[PDB]
Design a protein around this ligand. Structure first.
Ligand SMILES: N=C(N)N[C@@H]1CCCCNC(=O)[C@H](CCCCN)NC(=O)[C@H](Cc2ccc3ccccc3c2)NC(=O)Cc2cccc(c2)CNC(=O)[C@@H](CC2CCCCC2)NC1=O
Lengths: 151, 40
């Protein structure tokens, strides 16, 4: 099925390669998680619809639906779904990726590779982007862009 | 290869949650392959 919620993306013993969001009948994840491969959901199959390697995003069953934006000001929550661990909310004040094409909110939180695609939320529970495309800074820790698509 | 999904939870904000992490302001570049790097 395609019931709303957050999902693990698994491969098969089974390995968690990522996470994604089901909203409005569309599954949203990061391109590097699935490379656009079809996804089994119960007895059904979800096919890729749209994606962009540069944004590192892919949607299944329809166009990208997530359009909430970080307000540049407020704290957010990473709904982290790490491999082998229950989903947990982590609240943080984003930093900023300053790029030649504008600023992007960015969260300084470090999780295993298979946490990629975990949603980042605003105070209303809307998904303002997905975790897992980022940089490593001098001390070894990680900063993820808040990666959001266009609806 | 069987790639499949399994539900892990409801998408909701948690009241009185753990507030952690810093807020770095970083100069960054993004290449056409989707890789971020730091501007040095
Ligand atoms: N390295 C640290 N601290 N944290 C990472 C967090 C991973 C979060 C999910 N995202 C990804 O897997 C993407 C995939 C690829 C998307 C590509 N478009 N990836 C990344 O963005 C980065 C990209 C990158 C790499 C090197 C850079 C150097 C300079 C500037 C920018 C850079 C950007 N790719 C990596 O980070 C790969 C990497 C590099 C070096 C070492 C490791 C992994 C080994 N680290 C890990 O095994 C876990 C360690 C634990 C897990 C939870 C407990 C604390 C941290 N962390 C980690 O794996």
């Amino acid at each position: 099925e395609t019931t709303d919620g957050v999902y693990r993306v698994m491969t098969r013993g089974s390995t968690q390669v990522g996470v994604g969001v089901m909203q409005e009948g569309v599954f949203h994840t990061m391109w590097h998680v699935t490379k656009g491969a079809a996804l089994r959901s119960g007895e059904g199959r979800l096919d890729p619809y749209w994606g962009d390697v540069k944004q590192d995003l892919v949607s299944y069953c329809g166009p990208w639906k997530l359009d909430a934006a970080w307000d540049g000001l407020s704290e957010v929550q990473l709904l982290a779904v790490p491999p082998g661990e229950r989903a947990k909310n982590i609240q943080t004040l984003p930093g900023i990726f300053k790029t030649k094409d504008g600023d992007i909110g960015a969260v300084a939180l470090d999780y295993p590779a298979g946490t990629s695609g975990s949603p980042i939320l605003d105070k209303c529970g809307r998904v303002i982007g997905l975790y897992g495309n980022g940089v490593v800074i001098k001390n070894g820790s990680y900063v993820s862009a808040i990666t959001q698509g266009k609806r | 290869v069987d790639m499949y999904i399994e539900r892990a939870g409801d998408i909701t904000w948690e009241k009185d949650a753990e507030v952690t992490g810093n807020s770095p302001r970083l100069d960054v570049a993004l290449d056409e392959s989707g890789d971020f790097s730091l501007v040095e």
